[PDB]
Amino acid sequence: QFNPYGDNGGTILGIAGEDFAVLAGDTRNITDYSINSRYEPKVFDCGDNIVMSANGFAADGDALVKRFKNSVKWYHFDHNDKKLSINSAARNIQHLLYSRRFFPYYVYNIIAGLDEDGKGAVYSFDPVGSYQREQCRAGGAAASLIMPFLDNQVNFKNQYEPGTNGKVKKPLKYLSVEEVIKLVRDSFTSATERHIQVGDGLEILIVTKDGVRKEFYELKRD
Template sequence: MSCPAMAQLLSNTLYYKRFFPYYTFNILGGLDSDGKGCVYTYDAVGSYERVRYSAQGTGAGLIIPVLDNQLKSPSPLLLPAKDDVTPLSETEAIDLVKDVFASATERDIYTGDKVEIVVINASGIRQELMELRKD
């Protein structure tokens, strides 16, 4: 199943159960038919949008500004034209995820105690757990 098809299926599932028990805010990521990364963000009742990156939950208000600062180009008017999102290597992306969650954890009491990072690439699946709270 393609990622855009899965995005529609998740939207339908959330809308069908919009009051109970699936009142959740989701993020879906994968590859589209061109082999490019795609991220879909959802509201609680299933409306969705394809975006370049996203965050959900109580820490999202703290995480998104950091991601904007690190990933967006400073201006769409810069010449020569640049992609609107800075490409990152796998290591840089993982480090950025760790940094934004560590930062959000320090300021948001509802952000959890751990972050689970799952990397899926051609060599397989790798899972990494990072402790957030030390107190």
């Protein structure tokens, strides 16, 4: 029997800063125990200061991204070159996903950018279109390895102030872009050690009011 779905592996990570946002993902593409590519880009600049990554089944992921990029193009045509806000793009993507409620895009999608007040924003989707705005989200193969670490090191969960013994929590101080990138790199280096589908390379897209910048880092190739 024909199985229309597949699993291309990969892992993605989105973090929202105070005035910036990052969307990272490894560059390894796989089927079963084989490597297809050590560098196959997974996170895309979709225009209007929005970045996107559809992780899971690469054929459905490429189709969704391609369709959203197209939706941005037609939003400009139809509404006098108005900029598509991150919240508007998120709602649009919900409707793209739910158009296939009964033959879903097999992907977990994340977008990142800035909201209309200039603050950092990340939105996270399930395959059928449920979405919500988030601060921190790891998606894909090694999501379960990374998210607990981010709960601990970004939101300071289970961390209390010495001397008080559990009475006073550690205060939620904001993180810089340099601090976030460190947590991203360590997240993927740890994931690479314990997850066979994670490795080869790491590509990060950083979003600020100035635009979209890229950073690439090697990962273990075993």
